[PDB]
Design a protein around this ligand. Structure first.
Ligand SMILES: C[C@H](Oc1ccnc(-c2noc([C@@]3(C)CCCc4sc(N)c(C#N)c43)n2)n1)[C@@H]1CCC[N@H+]1C
Ligand SMILES: Nc1nc2c(ncn2[C@@H]2O[C@H](COP(=O)(O)OP(=O)(O)O)[C@@H](O)[C@H]2O)c(=O)[nH]1
Ligand SMILES: [Mg+2]
Length: 170
């Protein structure tokens, strides 16, 4: 049967979670997508010659630590932690997202990729080295993306699938 991979995209409002997701789903850059819409989207993709079903939860809205919201995030098998390379605050938020993922998955070993989005823009405020070094601190991959140009989009999502496979084989 076709394996389904439940992927969750997290990070500060405005970093490009929806734009990244829609680039994967529609193969189109959407510069405008209601910041409050949290929803999931499926797509069949070929990754290393194996057709699989991705189920992407594009998170949005207010931070809430109810049991209900924990259970919804807990359905995720892997997480993209997204910041924007021109927004230092979004990068400084990453550790909070990672901490909450570890808590809700009750694991120090959750499949995860650090994503630096908006790589097409010139206004960088977060050095690549600092981002690479944070991913190293966590022991996870770092991928530079642009939802505008499609740079890194498959790399980010497909690496996460590969991380989930390797975790499932542990
Ligand atoms: C960086 C923060 O801001 C926001 C703003 C919006 N969301 C968050 C946020 N943190 O984790 C999460 C997720 C969705 C991530 C996956 C796992 C779980 S499990 C659960 N219950 C979740 C929730 N709500 C989450 N989201 N944080 C700063 C710092 C604290 C005050 N605050 C202003
Ligand atoms: N130049 C550029 N703008 C982007 C990129 N991704 C998203 N945006 C813009 O960033 C803003 C927020 O994007 P959105 O997808 O709504 O972010 P979300 O709140 O994380 O879902 C919008 O103005 C988008 O046009 C990107 O890679 N490059
Ligand atoms: Mg959004």
């Amino acid at each position: 049967g076709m394996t389904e991979y439940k992927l969750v995209v997290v990070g500060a409002c405005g970093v490009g979670k929806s734009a990244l997701t829609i680039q994967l789903i529609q193969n189109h850059f959407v510069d405008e997508y209601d910041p409050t819409i949290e929803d999931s989207y499926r797509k069949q993709v070929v990754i290393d010659g194996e057709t699989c079903l991705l189920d992407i939860l594009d998170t949005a809205g207010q931070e809430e630590y109810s049991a209900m919201r924990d259970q919804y995030m807990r359905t995720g098998e892997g997480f993209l932690c997204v910041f924007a390379i021109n927004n230092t605050k979004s990068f400084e938020d990453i550790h909070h997202y990672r901490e909450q993922i570890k808590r809700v998955k009750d694991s120090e070993d959750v499949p995860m990729v650090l994503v630096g989005n908006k790589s097409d823009l010139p206004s960088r405020t977060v050095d690549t080295k600092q981002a690479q070094d944070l991913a190293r601190s966590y022991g996870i991959p770092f991928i530079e993306t642009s939802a505008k140009t499609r740079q890194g989009v498959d790399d980010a999502f497909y690496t996460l699938v590969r991380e989930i496979r390797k975790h499932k084989e542990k």
